[PDB]
Amino acid sequence: AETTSMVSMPLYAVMYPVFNELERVNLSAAQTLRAAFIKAEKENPGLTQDIIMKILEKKSVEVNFTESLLRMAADRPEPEFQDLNEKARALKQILSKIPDEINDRVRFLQTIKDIASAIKELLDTVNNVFKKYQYQNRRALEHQKKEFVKYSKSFSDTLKTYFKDGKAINVFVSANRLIHQTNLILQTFK
Amino acid sequence: EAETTSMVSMPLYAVMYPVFNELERVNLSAAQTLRAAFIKAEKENPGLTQDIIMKILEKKSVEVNFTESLLRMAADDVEEYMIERPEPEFQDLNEKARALKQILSKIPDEINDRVRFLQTIKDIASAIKELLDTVNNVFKKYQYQNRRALEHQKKEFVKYSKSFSDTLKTYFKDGKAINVFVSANRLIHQTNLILQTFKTV
Ligand SMILES: O=P(O)(O)O[C@H]1[C@H](O)[C@@H](OP(=O)(O)O)[C@H](OP(=O)(O)O)[C@@H](OP(=O)(O)O)[C@H]1O
Known part of the structure; x- marks a missing residue:
């Protein structure tokens, strides 16, 4: 048989x-x-x-392609919304630089710190508008926030495993997901 | 759709x-x-x-391990490619091909011993030269239905042979054994193609 x-x-x-x-x-x-x-x-x-x-x-072709997607992923006048747009934008911008920063240990360590504070600022701003939506279907907010902090942790985990693995492509992919989740937060405000 | x-x-x-x-x-x-x-x-x-x-x-790790196992198996995959011609030179061709594929198959077992691996590489080189020499002699002595196909296949074999040599050079730089395994498998496949072409030609 x-x-x-x-x-x-x-x-x-x-x-x-x-x-x-x-x-x-x-x-x-x-x-x-x-x-x-x-x-x-x-x-x-x-x-x-x-x-x-x-x-x-052809993994290198795949690495190049995953890098370019990350670099590309960076692209209501209310004061609270202007803040949310700014914080989100800064985070996306920093994440999009990873491909060109990861090859230098020193500068990549600072980038990680830049990502940490950038996410911190974003979350603070998220908590600000959070305190003004007065429960008008706020459930979608506490949901999207947690989805973001879940991918944020998932990205943090990816960084740790990277400093022992050395597989950059996983960082690029994870950073991409984090950006998409960043956009989801902005979009949820419908 | 799109x-x-x-x-x-x-x-x-x-x-x-x-x-x-x-x-x-x-x-x-x-x-x-x-x-x-x-x-x-x-x-x-x-x-x-x-x-x-x-x-x-x-699935890279799964694929990598399988590739090594495939290389090890090559030593027992012979009868399907043997040339079925009576002449003595064809039997000698079957032997030279088998001997090459055998040594290439031992690479996974030898690669973890610098001294043994260096010798194995010398044996592979000699086995290749002897295989090509036998092919050349049989080319000159006999007639075929498609001599052009045979010559093309020999040259393909030479390309994969040089590609194998280049892979060795690179291996002594980065120490990635998988590339050597892959290249050996392709050289083995090219060896089999030569045999299969003599069978229909
Ligand atoms: O050592 P292992 O565990 O097999 O893992 C590495 C990574 O997969 C590398 O890519 P990444 O940095 O993205 O993790 C890859 O290089 P590329 O993907 O740059 O081609 C290496 O292969 P080589 O390419 O043969 O060196 C491969 O050996």
């Missing part, structure tokens, strides 16, 4: 898990992708292995 | 398309089916290709 070559293993150990998770987002896409990999693998055993390896060999 | 002209679709053209370009040489329908599958999925969900690539990158 075992005629499948060992070279085909990555199809089931790598691709199938990815397809299975994709079925919950786009069933049609997952099936099409899976069907295409199955077809190609069955007709030429070893193809999935080489495809996966080539993708790994 | 067009893949957005920033988030970049990896589709920067990563996947170059990869798919090679498969046309192996299986056109497969390169086309895969290309159509990714572009289709990307149009429906822009950013999907990027997520797929990121998930594959997360």
